[PDB]
């Protein structure tokens, strides 16, 4: 009953060092570069993510779509003490892998893993996980859900002025409805970070969208 995700974790556990998040990232990256491709990894993309965390120093981060925990390790390793990552993952086996990955990296105390669908878990954050508002949201789950989960987040009052959204894969395989909305809306100040996919030979990108506050009613 062996899976690609079990193999990734196994490769880390064998080749990385426990409590060393950087060796974990490098292990995953080497594996996915040289043995078999996997979703939601990549050091080039990781550079942009790093820079965003470093610049805004969020205290509360929400990630949609943990997969194997590469991005959770990536972000949580830069979080200040007391800072927390909440990460959502719809597939229980992947949720389990993410947990073990984070444990191995030594970050399990910085991260809460939620196993469920985003539209189900997001409205529970205030009541169940003591969230007031989020400082940063990383989107890397199902692409057709970027837009409605962003609207859901706004709806639920989880966004504040200055909340950073960072969306992966907005070019490949692309999230046109999402891009059109956040760029067209006065509620988001948007920046595009291109990133080359060196082996598939194509430019992808991340979108950073800074929440500006709600659209105000007409006078
Ligand atoms: C086919 O493309 C894919 C498939 C899987 C994924 C991943 C993913 C998505 C979710 C969802 S979906 C949803 C409504 N809520 C959540 C939390 N968790 N994990 C990364 C594994 C990303 C892209
Ligand atoms: K905009
Ligand atoms: Mg991705």
Curated annotation (Swiss-Prot):
Residues modified as Phosphoserine: 215-216
Names of the cofactor(s): Mg(2+)
Coiled-coil segments on the chain, per record: none
Binding site for S-adenosyl-L-methionine: 41, 63, 71, 89-90, 116-119, 140
Annotated binding of substrate, by residue: 143, 169, 198
Binding-site list for Mg(2+): 140, 168-169
Keyword line: Catecholamine metabolism, Cell membrane, Cytoplasm, Lipid metabolism, Magnesium, Membrane, Metal-binding, Methyltransferase, Neurotransmitter degradation, Phosphoprotein, S-adenosyl-L-methionine, Signal-anchor, Transferase, Transmembrane, Transmembrane helix
Keyword Transmembrane: yes
PTM field: The N-terminus is blocked.
Organism superkingdom: Eukaryota
Enzyme class: transferase
EC number: 2.1.1.6
Catalytic activity as recorded in UniProt: a catechol + S-adenosyl-L-methionine = a guaiacol + S-adenosyl-L-homocysteine + H(+); 2-hydroxyestrone + S-adenosyl-L-methionine = 2-hydroxy-3-methoxy-estrone + S-adenosyl-L-homocysteine + H(+); 4-hydroxyestrone + S-adenosyl-L-methionine = 4-methoxyestrone + S-adenosyl-L-homocysteine + H(+); 2-hydroxyestrone + S-adenosyl-L-methionine = 2-methoxyestrone + S-adenosyl-L-homocysteine + H(+)
Job of this protein: Catalyzes the O-methylation, and thereby the inactivation, of catecholamine neurotransmitters and catechol hormones. Also shortens the biological half-lives of certain neuroactive drugs, like L-DOPA, alpha-methyl DOPA and isoproterenol.
Similarity remark: Belongs to the class I-like SAM-binding methyltransferase superfamily. Cation-dependent O-methyltransferase family.
Designated name of the protein: Catechol O-methyltransferase
Organism: Rattus norvegicus
Gene coding for it: Comt
Portion of the full sequence shown: 45 to 263 of 264
